[PDB]
Amino acid sequence: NDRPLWFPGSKAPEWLDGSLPGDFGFDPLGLGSDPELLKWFVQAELVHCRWAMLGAAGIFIPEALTKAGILNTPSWNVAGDQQYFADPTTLFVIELILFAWAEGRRWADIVNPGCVNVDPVFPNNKLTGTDVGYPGGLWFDPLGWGQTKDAKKLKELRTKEIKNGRLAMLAVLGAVVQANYTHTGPIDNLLAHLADPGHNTIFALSNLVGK
Amino acid sequence: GEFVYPGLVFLYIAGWIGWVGRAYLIDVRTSKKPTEKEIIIDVPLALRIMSKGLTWPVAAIGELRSGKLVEKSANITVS
Amino acid sequence: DFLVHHAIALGLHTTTLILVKGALDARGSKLMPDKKEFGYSFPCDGPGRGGTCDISAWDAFYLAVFWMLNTIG
Amino acid sequence: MQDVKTYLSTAPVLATLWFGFLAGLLIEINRFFPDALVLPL
Amino acid sequence: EVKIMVEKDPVKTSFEKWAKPGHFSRTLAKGPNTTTWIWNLHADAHDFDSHTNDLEEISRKVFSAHFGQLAVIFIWLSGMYFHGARFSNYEAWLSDPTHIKPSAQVVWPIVGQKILNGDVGGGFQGIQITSGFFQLWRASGITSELQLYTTAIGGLIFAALMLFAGWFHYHKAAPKLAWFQNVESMLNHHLAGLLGLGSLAWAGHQVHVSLPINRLLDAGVDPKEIPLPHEFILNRDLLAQLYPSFSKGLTPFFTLNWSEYSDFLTFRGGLNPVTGGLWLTDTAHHHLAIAVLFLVAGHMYRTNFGIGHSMKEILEAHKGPFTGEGHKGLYEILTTSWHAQLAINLAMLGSLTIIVAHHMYAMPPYPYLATDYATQLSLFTHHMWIGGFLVVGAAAHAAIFMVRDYDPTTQYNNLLDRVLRHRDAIISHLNWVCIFLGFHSFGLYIHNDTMSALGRPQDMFSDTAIQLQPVFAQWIQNTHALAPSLTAPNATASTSLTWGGGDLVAVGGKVALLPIPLGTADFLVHHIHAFTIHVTVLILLKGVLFARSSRLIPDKANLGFRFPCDGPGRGGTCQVSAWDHVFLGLFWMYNAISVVIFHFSWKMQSDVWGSISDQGVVTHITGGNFAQSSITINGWLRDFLWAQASQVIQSYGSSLSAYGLLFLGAHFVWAFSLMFLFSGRGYWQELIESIVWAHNKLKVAPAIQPRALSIVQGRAVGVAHYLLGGIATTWAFFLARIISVG
Amino acid sequence: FASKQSLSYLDGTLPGDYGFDPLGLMDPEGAGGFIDPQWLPYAEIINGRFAMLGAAGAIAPEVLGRIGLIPQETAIPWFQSGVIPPVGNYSYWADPYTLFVLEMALMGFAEHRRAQDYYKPGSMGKQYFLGLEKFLGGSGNPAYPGGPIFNFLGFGKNEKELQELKVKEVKNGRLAMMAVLGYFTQAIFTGVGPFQNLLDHLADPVHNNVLTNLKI
Ligand SMILES: CCCCCCCCCCCCCCCC(=O)OC[C@H](COP(=O)(O)OC[C@@H](O)CO)OC(=O)CCCCCCCCCCCCCCC
Ligand SMILES: CC(/C=C/C=C(C)/C=C/[C@@]12O[C@]1(C)C[C@@H](O)CC2(C)C)=C\C=C\C=C(C)\C=C\C=C(C)\C=C\[C@@]12O[C@]1(C)C[C@@H](O)CC2(C)C
Ligand SMILES: CC(/C=C/C=C(C)/C=C/[C@@]12O[C@]1(C)C[C@@H](O)CC2(C)C)=C\C=C\C=C(C)\C=C\C=C(C)\C=C\[C@@]12O[C@]1(C)C[C@@H](O)CC2(C)C
Ligand SMILES: CCCCCCCCCCCCO[C@H]1O[C@H](CO)[C@@H](O[C@H]2O[C@H](CO)[C@@H](O)[C@H](O)[C@H]2O)[C@H](O)[C@H]1O
Numbered sequence A: 001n002d003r004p005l006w007f008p009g010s011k012a013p014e015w016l017d018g019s020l021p022g023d024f025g026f027d028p029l030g031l032g033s034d035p036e037l038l039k040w041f042v043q044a045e046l047v048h049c050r051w052a053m054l055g056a057a058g059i060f061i062p063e064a065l066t067k068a069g070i071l072n073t074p075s076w077n078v079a080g081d082q083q084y085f086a087d088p089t090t091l092f093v094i095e096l097i098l099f100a101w102a103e104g105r106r107w108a109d110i111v112n113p114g115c116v117n118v119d120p121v122f123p124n125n126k127l128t129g130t131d132v133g134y135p136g137g138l139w140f141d142p143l144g145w146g147q148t149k150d151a152k153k154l155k156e157l158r159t160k161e162i163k164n165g166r167l168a169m170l171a172v173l174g175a176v177v178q179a180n181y182t183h184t185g186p187i188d189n190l191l192a193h194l195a196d197p198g199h200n201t202i203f204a205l206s207n208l209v210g211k
Numbered sequence B: 001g002e003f004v005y006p007g008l009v010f011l012y013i014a015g016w017i018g019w020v021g022r023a024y025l026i027d028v029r030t031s032k033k034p035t036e037k038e039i040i041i042d043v044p045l046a047l048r049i050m051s052k053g054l055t056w057p058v059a060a061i062g063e064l065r066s067g068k069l070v071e072k073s074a075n076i077t078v079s
Numbered sequence C: 001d002f003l004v005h006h007a008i009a010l011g012l013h014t015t016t017l018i019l020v021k022g023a024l025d026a027r028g029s030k031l032m033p034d035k036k037e038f039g040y041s042f043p044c045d046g047p048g049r050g051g052t053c054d055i056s057a058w059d060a061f062y063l064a065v066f067w068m069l070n071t072i073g
Numbered sequence D: 001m002q003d004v005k006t007y008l009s010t011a012p013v014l015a016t017l018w019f020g021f022l023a024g025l026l027i028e029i030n031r032f033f034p035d036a037l038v039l040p041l
Numbered sequence E: 001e002v003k004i005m006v007e008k009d010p011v012k013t014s015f016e017k018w019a020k021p022g023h024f025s026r027t028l029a030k031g032p033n034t035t036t037w038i039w040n041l042h043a044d045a046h047d048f049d050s051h052t053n054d055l056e057e058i059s060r061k062v063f064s065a066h067f068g069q070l071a072v073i074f075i076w077l078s079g080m081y082f083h084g085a086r087f088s089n090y091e092a093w094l095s096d097p098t099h100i101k102p103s104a105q106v107v108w109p110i111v112g113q114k115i116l117n118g119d120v121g122g123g124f125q126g127i128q129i130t131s132g133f134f135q136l137w138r139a140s141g142i143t144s145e146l147q148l149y150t151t152a153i154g155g156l157i158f159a160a161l162m163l164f165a166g167w168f169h170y171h172k173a174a175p176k177l178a179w180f181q182n183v184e185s186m187l188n189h190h191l192a193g194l195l196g197l198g199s200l201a202w203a204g205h206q207v208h209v210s211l212p213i214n215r216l217l218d219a220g221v222d223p224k225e226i227p228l229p230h231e232f233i234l235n236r237d238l239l240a241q242l243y244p245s246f247s248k249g250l251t252p253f254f255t256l257n258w259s260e261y262s263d264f265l266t267f268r269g270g271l272n273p274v275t276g277g278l279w280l281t282d283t284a285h286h287h288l289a290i291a292v293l294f295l296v297a298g299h300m301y302r303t304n305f306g307i308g309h310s311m312k313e314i315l316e317a318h319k320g321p322f323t324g325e326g327h328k329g330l331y332e333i334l335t336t337s338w339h340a341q342l343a344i345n346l347a348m349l350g351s352l353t354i355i356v357a358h359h360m361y362a363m364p365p366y367p368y369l370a371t372d373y374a375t376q377l378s379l380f381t382h383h384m385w386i387g388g389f390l391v392v393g394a395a396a397h398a399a400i401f402m403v404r405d406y407d408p409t410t411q412y413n414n415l416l417d418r419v420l421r422h423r424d425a426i427i428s429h430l431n432w433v434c435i436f437l438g439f440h441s442f443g444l445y446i447h448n449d450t451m452s453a454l455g456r457p458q459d460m461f462s463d464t465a466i467q468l469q470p471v472f473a474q475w476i477q478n479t480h481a482l483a484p485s486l487t488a489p490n491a492t493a494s495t496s497l498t499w500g501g502g503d504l505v506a507v508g509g510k511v512a513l514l515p516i517p518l519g520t521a522d523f524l525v526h527h528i529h530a531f532t533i534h535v536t537v538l539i540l541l542k543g544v545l546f547a548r549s550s551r552l553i554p555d556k557a558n559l560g561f562r563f564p565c566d567g568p569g570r571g572g573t574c575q576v577s578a579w580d581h582v583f584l585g586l587f588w589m590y591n592a593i594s595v596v597i598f599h600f601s602w603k604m605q606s607d608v609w610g611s612i613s614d615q616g617v618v619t620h621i622t623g624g625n626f627a628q629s630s631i632t633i634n635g636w637l638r639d640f641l642w643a644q645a646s647q648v649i650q651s652y653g654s655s656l657s658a659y660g661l662l663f664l665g666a667h668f669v670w671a672f673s674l675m676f677l678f679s680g681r682g683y684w685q686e687l688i689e690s691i692v693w694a695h696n697k698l699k700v701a702p703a704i705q706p707r708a709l710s711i712v713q714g715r716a717v718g719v720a721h722y723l724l725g726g727i728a729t730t731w732a733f734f735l736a737r738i739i740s741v742g
Numbered sequence F: 001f002a003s004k005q006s007l008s009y010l011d012g013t014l015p016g017d018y019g020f021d022p023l024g025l026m027d028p029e030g031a032g033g034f035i036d037p038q039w040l041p042y043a044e045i046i047n048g049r050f051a052m053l054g055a056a057g058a059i060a061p062e063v064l065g066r067i068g069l070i071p072q073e074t075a076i077p078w079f080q081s082g083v084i085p086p087v088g089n090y091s092y093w094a095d096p097y098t099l100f101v102l103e104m105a106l107m108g109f110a111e112h113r114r115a116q117d118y119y120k121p122g123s124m125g126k127q128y129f130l131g132l133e134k135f136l137g138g139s140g141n142p143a144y145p146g147g148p149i150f151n152f153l154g155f156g157k158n159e160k161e162l163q164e165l166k167v168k169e170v171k172n173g174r175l176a177m178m179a180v181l182g183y184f185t186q187a188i189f190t191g192v193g194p195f196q197n198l199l200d201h202l203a204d205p206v207h208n209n210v211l212t213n214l215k216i
């Protein structure tokens, strides 16, 4: 199977045969050698990707709107220390209680596929997803996309999500590191790079012999 | 609080560790090669046994009364 | 005084352990089931079966004398 | 990866991990609850 | 003949064998049945020649393991440099070397550990260190934490490089056996490159960096105001301001006008009056001369280019009428067995380390090191212990070679065979020497004790009573003190201040060095040293010579190198193996080194170290009581152990409490070793039988059958815990005392 | 045909082969690692081509400044352009470390591709590059890729002219390697540009040689 690789001319590892979406044969350390760990890691990557997409949107779009003056949200770094309707610990406990149920259903489906597909209260709901990680149904798929029957058209959309989500993870890590290293918002960092690309960079802050 | 309460807490913890160790040994004893599991620990089975140790006093009294705690035919030397 | 009487109890029970182990296992053990044929005092039973240094009951006496001296000290 | 998991289950490695976790837990407890001589409860 | 020979991809890189604990051994690979398997696994791990029979695999494993040890050493050096860059008061110490105590370790506040963070000075709290890294860094010219951090990063990079090199040369490109046997090429490359080029590079660093920076520091310039090292290279005007001969460039070097460089390449003895250390210009001329000598020496042995000496012919040529075939057959032994090379190298390295200790206290090479008494004592004791351990290991691995790799076919009438044929005479004469030395020295001590107890001090072997002067040592001292006038006229002062002639060097109100008088007590103590050393040599040499056979056991070489006994027959044959001879030599080496370090500590505290005040009056730490109180065993017991242990036993509640804690713990561990040393295996096996019955009664017996430790393992555990306890006791005692009074 | 012994493995098929190998580095008996006989000629050619570029580019700006083509603000010696800031520095549109990062990115693409073609000869012309993978399939010898880009004029159409061109390339490359070493050493000893050194040796040949410059 000749598909594009992360490293042209190299050989795809045996455990990566190109079935999974976003499979460019990237596994230098061989962490996906064990098939069961491979399935666990597929699920972990999907979850980290979706969480990172949500986080990247919620980090970058509010800052852009604040910079444009449309909104007045604080910086994402300081939003933890703001005055909300309740003490955070209470909000954290509520969060833990709700994700207990959600994560428990997801965990039960990962461990034993096809075992939590029916609504426990009204038994006539019945999520209509057939793959682990893609619940389908009405709650998680109202518009019917992703339930199509076309071959390699599902792989296309799944690769789309996989790639926008990997980019989101890299972007979120970048936002965190940039906030820690240069004490300013990400949009100011972008405008600094755009103002003077040659000199406004990571080397601008440090003091080096050459410059 | 000087002696009795910490003593009870220690007795609970030590009984927990001893009971789960004994349970793991008993479960490993019937295996293809018990010594291999004796040096290389079966982590999932060990975790299951370790988690089941919360109610160790009840299980201990249960096996004491059920007659499955002690042995009667053991190796001895020339008396 | 509490701590010292407890150390003394340790010494007494340990010396008793050594001496009683020597007396009861004098006629034989798993490592050498026919010790009674070799008398009270003999050096060893050779390096076979893993090594049998200090195997007789005389050697238990020998070991317990050190613990007696330590306890009385 | 199966061989790595088997190696990580050996007695010295598991003992190191377990005792490191236990020592960390005790150290943190003594950091937040220091100088504890008698049990208040 | 000499060429690069390697094999491509010999061993595949995988984690499969990491899950097979005993893969390297054909008997251990089957798994454990008793608890003896674990000890056998951890005991046979790095004994490569017992696994396979071909020299190629052994050589490759040795090469890769040496790469690994190099990587570990690089990690250690990087750690020292980083911990000095971030957790030290090195800059404050640089400002005031004579009042700030060096410190590079800081403890966390958890369980009362706060008390260990002492007030070392410079607005800093931490553990005072005695490794002497501050003095070495100052001599190197380091004046900031940035340089130390850069060195730490470089050390980490080098550790990674060594790890990669080890992996490469084992798992990817392994050299062949013919590559390792190029001893002529190995000696040429190592002796020329590693030694001469390294010494030349260090001489270059000294001349171009260390001389100006230390010159400015000694003048009195504040460390923050001194220009950086590259400013003396980019701007030679500054270096010519300090040493004017740099203004001539390299023209005097190539025109052979070497006398022009006499202002920074000097030959002067003694110490710098400001810092109490050796002049760095002498260190420059001497690392340069060493570089030249080693570079000349490294072009001696024959290689692909015809010229040179051949070691085999040289060895086969030197033989005479007393020794039969002479040195014939040694080349094959030394190019065939790793153990013979290990024995020779261990012996030489241990002797060299002892020489390092002596020369380093006598001629302190670093600034402000002589007046830091704790550092001097620590360095001397440490490298002396290291040398003792290495010289014992030499005998151990020589006996291993004799048991395993010896071949009587190759050795017919050479030196080895003729040594093995007159061994009874050697051992007998050496036994007589040991007895004679022991009597006529320790009996002198006991005679002194008895005379002192009887109230007859006029019958003692003391300076005031019957005298025993060391006339030979006194003559050597006087001769070496008068060298700068007759036999080494170009020297300014003598090699060291310890010789009889000379004066006093004082730095910050403390004596750096001073002439060391030798009297009756010194005579007694060196002859004690001779006794202990000849006895240790007797034990180890008897072990090596009788390793293959004797009259008692004609076939000892069949039983192996490390076996417990050969049964209770023939009266009893316990400890007839060379391993047990090493086991006893370890105890006697401990005895010898302990006496040596006690002699050094007492003599220095009593006659050299001290405080000097106005008008040049010297007060010593113990007030010169070594000459009178060291001639008796009671004198030692009272005036050294009882008097000088007051600091370690009173250190509770201060920053020195850890030393008292470890003092007690070391006495404890030393006592604990006696239960392994004095007992036997059968008792513990029977006790374990009873305990196993107890565990069986509750269905909780282990699958791996518990077993008592083997006889050899019992001996090894006993000796290891014994040595650890004794050495740690001495460590805590010395450090507490010298940190308190130094 | 020159220099030292005919080592019995340097038969003469290689361009520039004269049997010069005193240390026997290219003996194929034990030939693992980077001392493989198939790697050393390629490495010689690569440091040689880079040395040709380096020598030409380190001597060009000073000569152009002396003639007058380029502004005298850019006629600085090679070591006063930014390689060694302690010696001399020039201000470009970016600081030298951003320039280094960009250079490492571009050279990383080029060099990792060239390496993959060396190790996997047929590759780099199979996967989809941005349309240029068609011209990037090196034909045969890794050191001589050719094609519509690397040889876009069509030299060496016949075998013999190609042999002459290969020999010429090897000699100019070795000469430039020695020239670059000379640039380094003369910069250390004299502190001026190589062209100034040439003019100094030409003006007073007897008093302006290495023996005079022993004092710096
Ligand atoms: C960073 C410095 C370097 C670190 C280690 C790098 C190791 C790289 C791979 C080494 C083996 C090379 C040969 C592969 C081949 C090999 O080893 O044996 C081959 C074997 C093949 O197993 P399969 O079941 O795939 O195939 C069996 C066949 O019979 C049929 O296909 O196993 C593998 O392929 C696993 C490879 C990775 C094994 C290690 C995985 C984990 C490594 C990292 C552990 C730490 C992770 C930390 C994460 C934070
Ligand atoms: C980078 C990352 C992981 C990177 C992993 C890599 C590269 C692994 C590489 C390899 O393993 C492979 C593939 C194969 C192996 O053989 C080799 C290696 C090389 C080992 C995860 C990021 C993961 C990033 C995640 C999950 C981000 C989540 C963000 C959230 C939830 C944000 C929430 C908020 O920002 C809002 C929205 C606004 C405010 O409320 C504030 C908060 C609360 C902060
Ligand atoms: C690559 C190279 C030079 C590259 C230079 C570059 C890119 C320069 C770039 C720049 O300058 C510019 C343009 C402009 C500046 O502003 C900036 C920089 C960036 C500075 C030189 C290689 C130089 C390589 C050299 C000199 C190699 C010498 C090898 C010898 C002599 C070998 C001899 C033998 O190996 C044989 C043949 C056979 C064996 O058996 C025996 C022995 C004797 C071992
Ligand atoms: C193995 C080599 C490792 C180190 C590599 C880098 C070496 C750098 C040092 C070599 C330069 C020697 O420097 C020495 O001569 C220089 C001239 O040549 C002098 O430089 C002086 O004259 C130069 C012109 O020639 C001027 O541009 C300088 O401003 C002036 O300071 C230095 O004042 C002197 O210190």
Ligand code: SF4
Pocket (backbone or CB within 6 Å): C043, C044, C045, C046, C047, C051, C052, C053, C054, E564, E565, E566, E567, E568, E572, E573, E574, E575, E711
């Ligand atoms: S070593 Fe032990 S078993 Fe061997 S003879 Fe001596 S006492 Fe007996």
